[PDB]
């Protein structure tokens, strides 16, 4: 039992009881969410290929935490032109746990 879902402009292959980090969602911690845009559900030997979205399929999850990724450092340097610039970045994410896959 696994599914392919779309969230945050990316696609994720998903199995039940899995932890994965996705782009930040506007959901409070501990709240349940569902994913209606399911592209593929495969149940052992049975594979439902989704004409664009598999009809009736839905993948539920609960929000575990919010956080930020490790800092990356940006530098812009133009040699012998007297120019330099620095910047920092930490990207937000939401961690969700997949509770149930409805085929």
């Amino acid at each position: 039992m696994y599914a392919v879902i779309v969230t945050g402009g990316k696609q994720h292959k998903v199995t039940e009881g899995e932890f994965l980090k996705v782009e930040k969602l506007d959901v409070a911690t501990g709240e349940a969410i569902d994913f209606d845009r399911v592209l593929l559900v495969a149940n052992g030997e049975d594979v439902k290929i989704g004409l664009p979205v598999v009809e009736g399929a839905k993948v539920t999850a609960e929000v575990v935490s919010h956080g930020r990724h490790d800092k990356v450092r940006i530098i812009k340097f133009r040699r012998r032109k007297h120019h330099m610039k620095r910047q920092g970045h930490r990207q937000w994410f939401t961690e969700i746990k997949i509770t149930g896959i409805q085929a």
Partner: protein, 117 residues
Amino acid sequence: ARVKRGVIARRRHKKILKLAKGYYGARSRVFRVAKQAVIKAGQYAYRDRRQRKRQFRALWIARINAGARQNGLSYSRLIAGLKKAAIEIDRKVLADLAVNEKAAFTAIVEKAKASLA
């Protein structure tokens, strides 16, 4: 008010020499050489965040080609067939099924084939 530079200058040199850890020879232990090495390392890292996305699409596309020709289809004919029917599955997800879930990849290639492409 005479200001001495000893403490501040030492704190600034140690920040650079800590980023130069693991470099070869003088690039990890003298400030003048380690300063240039840290700058060039950050120049490379900025450019390689763009190239990471290019190197991974090329890897997915090459693996999809290998899996499609095992089912009697080329990469360019499979992509046209997928777009003809419905499918919006990524090259990233497609390359994962080609290696791990081979029975699901065959079903998709067979459906793309049935769109006469």
